[PDB]
Amino acid sequence: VWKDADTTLFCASDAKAYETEVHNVWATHACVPTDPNPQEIHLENVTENFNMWKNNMVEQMHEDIISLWDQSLQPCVKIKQACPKISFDPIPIHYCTPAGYVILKCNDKNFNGTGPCKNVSSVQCTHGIKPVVSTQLLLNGSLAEEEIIIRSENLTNNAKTIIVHLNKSVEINCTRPSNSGGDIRKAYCEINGTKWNKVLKQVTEKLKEHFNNKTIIFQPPSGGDLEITMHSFNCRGEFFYCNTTQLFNNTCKGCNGTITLPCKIKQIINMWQGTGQAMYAPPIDGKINCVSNITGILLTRDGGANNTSNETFRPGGGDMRDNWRSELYKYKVVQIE
Ligand SMILES: N=C(N)NCC(=O)N1CCC[C@H](C(=O)Nc2ccc(Cl)c(F)c2)C1
Ligand SMILES: *[C@@H]1O[C@H](CO)[C@@H](O)[C@H](O)[C@H]1NC(C)=O
Ligand SMILES: *[C@@H]1O[C@H](CO)[C@@H](O)[C@H](O)[C@H]1NC(C)=O
Ligand SMILES: *[C@@H]1O[C@H](CO)[C@@H](O)[C@H](O)[C@H]1NC(C)=O
Ligand SMILES: *[C@@H]1O[C@H](CO)[C@@H](O)[C@H](O)[C@H]1NC(C)=O
Ligand SMILES: *[C@@H]1O[C@H](CO)[C@@H](O)[C@H](O)[C@H]1NC(C)=O
Ligand SMILES: *[C@@H]1O[C@H](CO)[C@@H](O)[C@H](O)[C@H]1NC(C)=O
Ligand SMILES: *[C@@H]1O[C@H](CO)[C@@H](O)[C@H](O)[C@H]1NC(C)=O
Ligand SMILES: *[C@@H]1O[C@H](CO)[C@@H](O)[C@H](O)[C@H]1NC(C)=O
Ligand SMILES: *[C@@H]1O[C@H](CO)[C@@H](O)[C@H](O)[C@H]1NC(C)=O
Ligand SMILES: *[C@@H]1O[C@H](CO)[C@@H](O)[C@H](O)[C@H]1NC(C)=O
Incomplete structure (x- = not known):
């Protein structure tokens, strides 16, 4: 006992x-x-x-x-x-x-x-x-058994991070192709836009339940450093920074084929451990590929929306x-x- x-x-x-x-x-x-x-x-x-x-x-x-x-x-x-x-x-x-x-x-x-x-x-x-370790999107985790789950230490307080637990995974395929010649740091992730936007509409529908039926809006982050404005993650040892602007497009549909996120491999990283900036060696040579399951999303909810018809959410991360x-x-x- x-x-x-x-x-x-x-x-x-x-x-x-x-x-x-x-x-x-x-x-x-x-x-x-x-x-x-x-x-x-x-x-x-x-x-x-x-x-x-x-x-x-x-x-x-x-x-x-x-x-x-x-x-x-x-x-x-x-x-x-x-x-x-x-x-x-x-x-x-x-x-x-x-x-x-x-x-x-x-x-x-x-x-x-x-x-x-x-x-x-x-x-x-x-x-x-x-x-x-990643920002904005939770990769390779477990899926919610039944519904999409909104997690928050307190959903009323805007200061507390939200964890969206997807009940179905959306595969994201990130590559830094091979071949001393060209910008060896350029990379990209490919996503199914139809799949992703179907799930994002379900997250939007589930968020509507919590906020007394309210226009749910997504806004790319303003505050924060490169690792939290960009979708960051380590792939085969290399640090990947990916622009997720196309995933939080409030437009989306003449817009639901294959989405290509622009990525970069960074050498100088502001460490998730708090220990500051650290510099790594230039990317290995050859095809650097990681295919992962998106199984969750990290969001912040904007303040000052108590007299409006909209709630605005931004991909977060960092902790x-x-x-x-x-x-x-x-x-x-x-x-x-
Ligand atoms: N200062 C304090 N108290 N804590 C550290 C901090 O304040 N942090 C936010 C500032 C930068 C850091 C980040 O999250 N770095 C990062 C690097 C690589 C990958 Cl792959 C990733 F997912 C994340 C963490
Ligand atoms: C990705 O998700 C599928 C089903 O959504 C699962 O069967 C598979 O094991 C997952 N892969 C990883 C690496 O977690
Ligand atoms: C508790 O979970 C088990 C499997 O984990 C399943 O039989 C059911 O969802 C629950 N059963 C009982 C007896 O509570
Ligand atoms: C995931 O959750 C939504 C409700 O938020 C539900 O409509 C949908 O059918 C679920 N998907 C699966 C595969 O269970
Ligand atoms: C989680 O569920 C509990 C049920 O006891 C509730 O008190 C709490 O407000 C819920 N939080 C969210 C974010 O749904
Ligand atoms: C959650 O949100 C605010 C706190 O600022 C308040 O209205 C409410 O009582 C809080 N509840 C809990 C359980 O923290
Ligand atoms: C991921 O993308 C790369 C580059 O386009 C491709 O060669 C690879 O086959 C893809 N993986 C899957 C499982 O489609
Ligand atoms: C993208 O997802 C949709 C949703 O079911 C699916 O029908 C379609 O085949 C997918 N596209 C590709 C190229 O896999
Ligand atoms: C509730 O939200 C839905 C979107 O899911 C919208 O179509 C509907 O107009 C909203 N209801 C009110 C009364 O605003
Ligand atoms: C991310 O890319 C979109 C379009 O690809 C662009 O509008 C936006 O400015 C980019 N983000 C940053 C922080 O530059
Ligand atoms: C996720 O799991 C797959 C399969 O196990 C692996 O190929 C991939 O590198 C993992 N992604 C990350 C970001 O670790």
Whole structure:
């Protein structure tokens, strides 16, 4: 019979030893060997409150990824050191409670993150979470089981980030083609405009429910730095900055074929870890391709709309805890009393 507590967690994964990919190397020396068998138990007739915005597991994961990137993705300049090209493809990470501690997991299929949960169970580990770092769009995550879910520590307060949990993924295919000749930094992502705009209309329809039927408008970000005005993400080791203006086109339809986002590979990065600007080596040679699932969106809601008929939303990002938070929302650690 538990109690809300914070225990230092431990990680488990199916990482391959002697693999050159940095996620496998970190998981091999930092997550449990052992090869565990965690198990579930339904808590019959039981209800419990959750808060995905006040979750210590979020900061536990955040400590891991920061440690993983510092050991694996070293910048040439911060400090003037080595910076080799590395193998980079995130793998799932499971988080597990030690003895005397359990994770409580919400099985409500329309759970929004905060509040009471009816289908509560106790598990030893979380599901496999891929630690994908990105802005504006959440990549390669899990999908909402039933409806599109709007997540917010408080949807009335405009200062609190919103996580849109898509119930169906939209594939985005980013490439920096090969061939000493030309701007080797130019890149691009291709998206199905028909697919994407169908989902964006469903997000628009779901946002309308929350804001007493109100013209929902999308505006590319003004404030913030390159990594948050642009859709940012690491692909095979390289830092990608993609202009997402075509995705938040309030127009869209003579406009629903293949959308091509212009991208760039950047060398000097304002680190998501807070540690400032850091410079990496120029792009590797050859075809750099990543095909990912868009599984969520990060939005800010403009202020000063209480006397209008419109709500205006902008793609956000910047705090990676929101990314971990988007996959850990159904969990909470509790000390077994
Ligand atoms: N200053 C404080 N308190 N925290 C750091 C901060 O304030 N940050 C916002 C300022 C810049 C940073 C960013 O998010 N960098 C980034 C880099 C590469 C990729 Cl792939 C990505 F998704 C994101 C993070
Ligand atoms: C989430 O659901 C709970 C139900 O108890 C509600 O109190 C809260 O306002 C909801 N938040 C959002 C953003 O839907
Ligand atoms: C709880 O979730 C399980 C699967 O996770 C499923 O049978 C159903 O959605 C719920 N069942 C009960 C008994 O609450
Ligand atoms: C992408 O989503 C599809 C279905 O939406 C899923 O079957 C597939 O495993 C996902 N891929 C990744 C890398 O998550
Ligand atoms: C996703 O959610 C919307 C409601 O927001 C619903 O209309 C749509 O049918 C759902 N799609 C799937 C594939 O379940
Ligand atoms: C959410 O929004 C505002 C806080 O500024 C207020 O109207 C409301 O009571 C808040 N509720 C919670 C649970 O934070
Ligand atoms: C992704 O785009 C590249 C460049 O156009 C292409 O060669 C590759 O086949 C695409 N991937 C898929 C799965 O279509
Ligand atoms: C784009 O998505 C629509 C939505 O169903 C689909 O019918 C169409 O085949 C897709 N286009 C391509 C080129 O895959
Ligand atoms: C409610 O929003 C819809 C768009 O989904 C719009 O067509 C309709 O006119 C709105 N209703 C009112 C009363 O403004
Ligand atoms: C992104 O691209 C669109 C059109 O491709 C352009 O209108 C917009 O100015 C670009 N964003 C920035 C910050 O330059
Ligand atoms: C998403 O997963 C796919 C398949 O596992 C992989 O090819 C791709 O590189 C991943 N995307 C990112 C941004 O890590």
